[PDB]
Ligand binder design. Structure first.
Ligand code: 363
Length: 337
């Protein structure tokens, strides 16, 4: 009953309004007749692909266990009463006004707004990393804003525990380790993404907008300069590593040349986040404690996870039929009864 596609969420949720297709499928706003407020509803139809099933179960478990101002929650989950009938799953969340991607398309951001947004992102990320979880897909369209500049991180379908050839909408925010298919990515890949987001807030355009795979690498090298052998210390393809090390030597481009009107403190922090070497890269607590964020930084008001997150049994080894069973169990609490 929307764009020709079924969206059965009534009778509680009425007055459907199409917002847009996303990672999982159709996203609509609806009127919650119980809470007398408009909400956002994700429709997911994952049960034919093993990876989508992973993503869905990942999203549900993470978001139901996390509790933080700067992280989207899950208000309700609608699905069929029997696992046989369950084809679609509807995830109900708070309706936000927009996301950072759209915002950066139309609006210029004051230095104080950039500073505050960055703080909220890192504050949320600090909690996520405290739960021993990597987000792995941080980007402007995954950062939601409400009417009063409150920021929430969303979409944890690609999240893993801190202990890939699938389609993604953009790779402009993926760390060099990820791009080079290394086997040992840590929490620092999220930090790299935030830096990219910081740079985009400062200029309203992406810092590394590659057209294709190898072009993505060239854009990075063109700004940061040629990587050393020590920078390329991850378990990576031997031929790909030799290729990078043989590319024309690039010098590092000064940040103030790319960002002439930016706060010098913002650029110093930006320099710490966009380091090629992951082990050189600044950590989330160190970023929060950077002078640029000093007016907001307060470790007494930055909640961490009560316990490190644990998918008690490992997930990507399970048949899609077993994952469906788990999704059914995790959503049983939201059923009438
Ligand atoms: C959960 C996802 C979501 N998305 C939007 C949104 C994104 N762009 N425009 C609205 C608003 N509220 C939301 N709640």
């Amino acid at each position: 009953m929307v764009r020709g596609q079924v969206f059965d969420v009534g009778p509680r949720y009425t007055n459907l309004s199409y917002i847009g297709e996303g990672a999982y499928g159709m996203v609509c706003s609806a009127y919650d007749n119980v809470n007398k407020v408009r909400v956002a509803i994700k429709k997911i139809s994952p049960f034919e692909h093993q990876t989508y099933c992973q993503r869905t179960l990942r999203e549900i478990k993470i978001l139901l266990r996390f509790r933080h101002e700067n992280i989207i929650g899950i208000n309700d989950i609608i699905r069929a009463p029997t696992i046989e009938q369950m084809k679609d799953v509807y995830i109900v969340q708070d309706l936000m006004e927009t996301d950072l991607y759209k915002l950066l398309k139309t609006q210029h951001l004051s230095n104080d707004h950039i500073c505050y947004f960055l703080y909220q992102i890192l504050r949320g990320l600090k909690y996520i990393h405290s739960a021993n979880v990597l987000h792995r897909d941080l980007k402007p369209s995954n950062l939601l804003l409400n009417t009063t500049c409150d920021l929430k991180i969303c979409d944890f379908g690609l999240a893993r525990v801190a202990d890939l050839t699938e389609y993604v909408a953009t790779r402009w925010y993926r760390a060099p380790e990820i791009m080079l298919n290394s086997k040992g990515y840590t929490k620092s890949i999220d930090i790299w993404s935030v830096g990219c987001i910081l740079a985009e807030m400062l200029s309203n355009r992406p810092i590394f907008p590659g057209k294709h795979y190898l072009d993505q690498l060239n854009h990075i090298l063109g700004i940061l300069g040629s990587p050393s052998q020590e920078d390329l210390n991850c378990i990576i393809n031997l031929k790909a590593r030799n290729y990078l090390l043989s590319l024309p030597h690039k010098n590092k481009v000064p940040w103030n040349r790319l960002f002439p009107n930016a706060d010098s403190k913002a650029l110093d922090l930006l320099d710490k986040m966009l380091t090629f070497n992951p082990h050189k890269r600044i950590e989330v607590e160190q970023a929060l404690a950077h002078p640029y964020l000093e007016q907001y930084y307060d470790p007494s008001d930055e909640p961490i996870a009560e316990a490190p997150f644990k998918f008690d049994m490992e997930l990507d080894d399970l048949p899609k039929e077993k994952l469906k069973e788990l999704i059914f169990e995790e959503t049983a609490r939201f059923q009438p009864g």
